[PDB]
Amino acid sequence: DNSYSYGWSFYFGALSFIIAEMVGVLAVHMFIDRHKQLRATA
Amino acid sequence: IDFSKPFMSLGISIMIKKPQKSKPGVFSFLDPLAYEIWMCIVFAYIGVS
């Protein structure tokens, strides 16, 4: 479709991305740890 | 009308806004790519990682 600028709803969707990837890492890190506990008892 | 002999000489000439210093910015190395690409390289680097 100028001085277009971005607002806080754009930067929330950008900040949401960052928090989602970090929780994804954290959730994988918990999955790894659950399975390592199983291997330990073995 | 009548005129005396001239008291001052002149010719038509051109006036311009002499110069334009344009001191380049400190963070000007990032001009080639727009601000969106840069922010989107940081987002496409966190995803890839």
UniProtKB/Swiss-Prot annotation, chain A:
The chain crosses the membrane at residues 12-32. It comes from the Eukaryota. It is found in: Membrane; Synapse, Synaptosome. Belongs to the PMP-22/EMP/MP20 family. CACNG subfamily. Regulates the trafficking and gating properties of AMPA-selective glutamate receptors (AMPARs). Promotes their targeting to the cell membrane and synapses and modulates their gating properties by slowing their rates of activation, deactivation and desensitization. Does not show subunit-specific AMPA receptor regulation and regulates all AMPAR subunits. Thought to stabilize the calcium channel in an inactivated (closed) state. The L-type calcium channel is composed of five subunits: alpha-1, alpha-2/delta, beta and gamma. Interacts with the PDZ domains of DLG4/PSD-95 and DLG1/SAP97. May interact with GOPC. Acts as an auxiliary subunit for AMPA-selective glutamate receptors (AMPARs). Found in a complex with GRIA1, GRIA2, GRIA3, GRIA4, CNIH2, CNIH3, CACNG3, CACNG4, CACNG5, CACNG7 and CACNG8. Interacts with GRIA1 and GRIA2. Interacts with MPP2. This is Voltage-dependent calcium channel gamma-2 subunit. It comes from Rattus norvegicus. The gene is Cacng2. The chain holds residues 163 to 212 of 323 of the full protein.
Curated annotation (Swiss-Prot), chain B:
The M4 transmembrane segment mediates tetramerization and is required for cell surface expression. The chain crosses the membrane at residues 35-49. Ionotropic glutamate receptor that functions as a ligand-gated cation channel, gated by L-glutamate and glutamatergic agonists such as alpha-amino-3-hydroxy-5-methyl-4-isoxazolepropionic acid (AMPA), quisqualic acid, and kainic acid. L-glutamate acts as an excitatory neurotransmitter at many synapses in the central nervous system and plays an important role in fast excitatory synaptic transmission. The gene is Gria4. It comes from Rattus norvegicus. Homotetramer or heterotetramer of pore-forming glutamate receptor subunits. Tetramers may be formed by the dimerization of dimers. Interacts with EPB41L1 via its C-terminus. Isoform 3 interacts with PICK1. Found in a complex with GRIA1, GRIA2, GRIA3, CNIH2, CNIH3, CACNG2, CACNG3, CACNG4, CACNG5, CACNG7 and CACNG8. Interacts with CACNG5 and PRKCG. Found in a complex with GRIA1, GRIA2, GRIA3, DLG4, CACNG8 and CNIH2. The postsynaptic actions of L-glutamate are mediated by a variety of receptors that are named according to their selective agonists. This receptor binds AMPA (quisqualate) > L-glutamate > kainate. This is Glutamate receptor 4. Palmitoylated. Depalmitoylated upon L-glutamate stimulation. Belongs to the glutamate-gated ion channel (TC 1.A.10.1) family. GRIA4 subfamily. It is found in: Cell membrane; Postsynaptic cell membrane; Cell projection, Dendrite. Detected in cerebellum.
